[PDB]
Design a protein around this nucleic acid. Structure first.
Lengths: 785, 36, 73
RNA sequence: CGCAAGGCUGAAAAAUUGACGGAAGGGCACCACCAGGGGUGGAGCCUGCG
RNA sequence: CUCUGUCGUGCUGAGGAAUCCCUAGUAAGCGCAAGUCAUCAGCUUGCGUUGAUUACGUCCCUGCCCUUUGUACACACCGCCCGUCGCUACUACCGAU
């Protein structure tokens, strides 16, 4: 019941997630690890990988005034502050909901702002490890951050927003594109010019300047249009000289210079790149006179260009440690020291112990690859219908054979003895070439997708487009039997070492285990949320585990099953793209898996409440009158220093506080708790009632609770003495407020009577005749009984 | 019996006598007795 | 929000003459939002508030009674 | 009498109305509080149940 | 049961932890009758007699239910409860074919 574990992972330089940084090193993002390369030699310096995290990384930021501490932002919504000296995550910030997308740093590096795709922009302190606060505008996701203090930002709703930080709310807004999207942000390092790239190939240019009145800080000083009318991915300025770079996710990067706006910004150079660039970045080399433009391109490459100012030249490149489009097939050699990896555009063969490429080739497309026994030559069946034969030792092309005309070779299998190969192509046939010369062909009804032999070479099994499997004998090609029971075409098959079991994977998200004698489905089993792509056993039963098999499935999962118990013994996570291929070890002790990530891996009380509120309010009032005494005697610094609950609620006065705590309860509860109140706190209550009637608000609540208190304590009040002064005050204030409110509402009702009479006067009648019969509201009021 | 309970609860058909309105005779549509 | 609605209405009435408020004519005057009905609604609700505040003063004379009692002692 | 009565097969959803909660406020209860009472449970007899 | 006398505590000992029930002709004591198509004689169901203590409040604990939508109009009051997702329309984005 041994499990498996991720041990090696390679074959990938910068992915399609953004935001490369330069340090003379290039710091780029793999799937989940942040890896650091040299560009001069292609050997990588290091990798940064946190074991607690499995989610992909998508934003990188270098701290200004201090390198060797770096911010990465993942997909889950987490920020990790790493060090470059020691490769550990010194701290983690888990505040966002999803998909960090833009990072930015302070001038002093104490403050770090993160904009996400959950639209919250969060600032972070770096000396207290707490989330400071949480800004909120932006109808849709944010795409650009910068620190001016002040904050500048921009989001997908074509909104550019200038936030304060002293008072956490927005100061100024503008909208850049009318019906479009503000997509990228660029700030000049002197904070004077800011350009925003919008979807139509537009770049809007804005001038900056370094509250109750009309505030205006950003000015839309104009618009320009670049050449490519694509989604402009990023805009990066030069740290020192007067240049910037605009690029969309495309094969062109436009560097412009800074001297109307059509005059002040001109096109310096348009650099053409080999593939679609994902993220450009800037690099200045100590002792160069040029511009190191460091592009990271989605087709798995790093390039480093020189740009001359007052043409381009591909100076440096990092492409060798990874395939360049997408790995489609793997096959490891018989000694399990090297593997061959087949991708659209190239072949690369690698040493496992060094996890490092040793040889390469150019092939057009690459469906299937398989090495021949004695691990000297490797076969590739490719979509144009061809089989090419290369080798490791001479590193050249040996042979080409046109098996099928315009039909992709979907299946390639070497005979277990090792004297022939079988090619199942997208035509209606499958061919048998021994060595290479055509021994025999096989005409089958539909397209053939995948086929494999028996490990004791007794019977062959093909898997068609009819959602069927046909198993034939090996000596003569008579139809031994067939398997049905799949609704979608079978995408893969593999049969056990002793030819006692067939596992068969369809596109119906499920697999079958067949008994291979009489063809009885030992078990149908549904195990994956998407189409299960490839399935393979482990050959060696010398450990006693020959009936175990892995299944690679398009929902990013490996699943490790045992057929005899019919049970899933492991689930293997660790890929974030629809995995394309896998292969097992001939020792069975490890396996390899090649994904759409372009990576491969090798796996080894109400009354008491208002009483306390009264007490708090009275203590606050004592502090306020003492502070008033202090500021009256001298204007020196003496803080009021009120209660933390007041300063947490937001410095509202205690009168507002006690008004909330008297309003919150229902009126029946108000009656009951005001009865519950003891006579000791009645003077506090009378003070607050006086202050309510003085600063008139909720005068019916004021009156009703004053009356309740007086009537349920009338004898104690007339016997006491201290209540005389407070009751004089509350009588004067209540009478003043009621007289004011009564006078205003009487004025309102008198004026309304007058204006209604005048309206009747204006609307009486105009003509006069024998018919005054033309000269009210009615309501229905249905009653059931 | 447990299976019959599960069948009834899933495809819910309870034999409960349902509360009929008291004045279905004189008031068949059951209009509201207020503002109309 | 009755007191805040009445005061700005009280400020609205002490700044504009009755003939102007009567000959107020705006094109959005049809059905329930006509000037007659709007003024009638304000008048009726203000009458209800005024009756309530009259009852409040009538009950608030109790404090003057209590002060006269403590005067008697 | 005829139809029903020919096996891509081999045991373990709907949703613009849906899923689960939280806080406050009520009402009820000798399966709750409160005041007391009384059983059983100690010894022997036995119906019954396991 | 009441009243009247003879004699005087003498293997001639009223039930632990726990758990359950009970609020007015109720608990409890007492006997008499019957044996009713199922059950019940190791008992069952009737019927009469004697008949109290203590609550009869409270949602504090333990729970259960219901409000936050509806179902009615005057006076009168109240005043936009809260979270995590699903589903739907639209918008743009990512990458394989």
């Amino acid at each position: 019941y041994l499990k498996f574990e991720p041990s090696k992972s390679f074959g990938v330089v910068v992915s399609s997630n953004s935001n490369l940084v330069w340090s003379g090193q290039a710091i780029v993002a793999a799937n989940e690890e942040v890896l650091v390369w040299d560009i001069k030699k292609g050997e990588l310096l290091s990798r940064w990988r946190d074991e607690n995290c499995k989610f992909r990384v998508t934003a990188i930021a270098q701290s200004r005034t201090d390198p060797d501490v770096f911010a990465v932002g993942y997909e889950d919504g987490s920020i990790r502050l790493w060090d470059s000296k020691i490769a550990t995550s010194v701290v983690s910030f888990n505040g966002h909901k999803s998909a960090i997308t833009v990072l930015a740093f302070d001038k002093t590096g104490v403050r770090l702002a993160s904009g996400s795709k959950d639209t919250d922009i969060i600032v972070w302190d770096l000396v207290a490890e707490v989330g400071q606060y949480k800004l909120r505008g932006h109808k849709d996701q944010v795409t650009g951050l910068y620190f001016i203090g002040f904050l500048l930002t921009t989001g997908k709703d074509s909104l550019i927003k200038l936030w304060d930080l002293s008072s956490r709310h927005c100061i100024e807004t503008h909208v850049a594109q009318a019906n479009g999207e503000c997509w990228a942000l660029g700030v000049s390092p002197d904070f004077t010019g800011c350009i925003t790239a919008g979807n139509d190939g537009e770049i809007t240019v804005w001038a900056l300047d370094a509250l109750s009145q009309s505030v205006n800080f950003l000015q839309n000083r104009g618009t320009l249009h670049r050449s490519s009318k694509e989604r402009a991915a990023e805009v990066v300025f030069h740290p020192l000289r007067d240049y910037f770079a605009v690029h969309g996710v495309e094969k062109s990067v436009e560097i412009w210079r800074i001297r109307e706006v059509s005059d002040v910004f001109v096109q310096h150079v348009i650099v053409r790149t080999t593939g679609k660039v994902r993220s450009v970045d800037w690099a200045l080399n100590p002792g160069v006179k040029d511009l190191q433009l460091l592009v990271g391109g989605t087709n798995n490459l790093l390039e480093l260009y020189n740009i001359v100012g007052k043409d381009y030249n591909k100076a440096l490149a990092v492409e060798l440690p990874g395939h360049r489009t997408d790995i489609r097939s793997v096959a490891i050699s018989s000694d399990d020291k090297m593997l061959a990896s087949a991708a659209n555009g190239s072949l690369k063969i690698w040493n496992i112990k060094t996890q490092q490429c040793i040889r390469t080739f150019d092939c057009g497309y690459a469906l299937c690859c398989a090495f021949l026994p004695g691990d000297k030559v490797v076969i590739v069946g490719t979509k144009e219908g061809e089989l090419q034969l290369y080798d490791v030792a001479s590193a050249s092309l040996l042979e080409t054979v046109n098996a099928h005309d315009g039909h992709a070779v979907w299946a390639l299998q070497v005979h277990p003895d090792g004297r022939s190969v079988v090619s199942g192509g997208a035509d209606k046939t499958a061919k048998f070439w021994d060595f290479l010369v055509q021994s025999r062909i096989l005409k089958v009804s539909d397209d053939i997708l995948s086929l494999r032999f028996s490990p004791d070479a007794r019977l062959l099994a093909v898997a068609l487009l009819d959602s069927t499997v046909k198993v034939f004998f090996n000596d003569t090609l008579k139809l031994y039997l067939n398997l049905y029971g799949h609704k979608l075409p079978v995408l893969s098959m593999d049969i056990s070492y002793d030819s006692k079991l067939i596992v068969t994977s369809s596109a119906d998200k499920n697999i079958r285990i067949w008994g291979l004698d009489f063809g009885d489905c030992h078990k149908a089993l549904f195990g994956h949320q998407d189409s299960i792509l490839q399935v393979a056993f482990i050959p060696h039963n010398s450990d006693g585990n020959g009936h175990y098999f892995f299944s690679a499935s398009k929902d990013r999962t490996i699943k490790y099953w045992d057929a005899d118990k019919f049970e899933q013994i492991q689930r293997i996570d660790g890929h974030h793209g629809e995995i394309w291929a896998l292969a097992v070890s001939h020792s069975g002790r490890f396996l390899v898996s090649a994904s759409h990530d372009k990576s491969i891996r090798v796996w080894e009380m109400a009354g008491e409440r208002i009483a306390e509120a009264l007490e708090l309010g009275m203590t606050d009032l004592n502090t306020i009158r003492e502070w008033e005494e202090a500021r009256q005697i001298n204007p020196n610094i003496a803080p009021p220093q009120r209660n933390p609950i007041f300063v947490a609620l937001g410095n509202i006065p205690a009168e507002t506080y006690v008004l909330n705590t008297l309003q919150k309860i229902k009126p029946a509860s108000l009656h009951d708790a005001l009865l519950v109140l003891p006579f000791s706190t009645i003077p506090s209550l009378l003070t607050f009632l006086n202050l309510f009637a003085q600063r008139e608000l909720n005068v019916p609540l004021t009156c009703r609770i004053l009356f309740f208190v007086l009537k349920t304590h009338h004898k104690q009040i007339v016997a006491s003495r201290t209540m005389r002064a407070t009751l004089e005050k509350v009588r004067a204030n209540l009478r003043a407020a009621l007289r004011r409110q009564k006078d205003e509402m009487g004025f309102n009702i008198a004026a309304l009577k007058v204006v209604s009479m005048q309206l009747r006067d204006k609307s009486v009648r105009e003509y006069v005749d024998e018919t005054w019969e033309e000269k009210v509201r009615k309501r229905a009021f249905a009653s059931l009984s | 019996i447990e299976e019959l309970i599960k069948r009834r609860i899933l495809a819910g058909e309870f034999d409960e006598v349902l509360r009929r309105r008291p004045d279905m005779f004189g008031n068949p549509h059951g209009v509201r007795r207020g503002l109309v | 929000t009755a007191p805040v609605a009445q005061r700005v209405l009280w400020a609205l009435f002490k700044s504009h003459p009755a003939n102007k408020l009567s000959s107020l004519s705006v094109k959005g005057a049809r059905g329930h939002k006509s000037l007659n009905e709007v003024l009638d609604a304000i008048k009726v609700y203000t009458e209800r508030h005024y009756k309530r505040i009259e009852e409040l003063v009538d009950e608030s004379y109790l404090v003057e009674y209590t002060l006269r009692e403590m005067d008697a002692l």
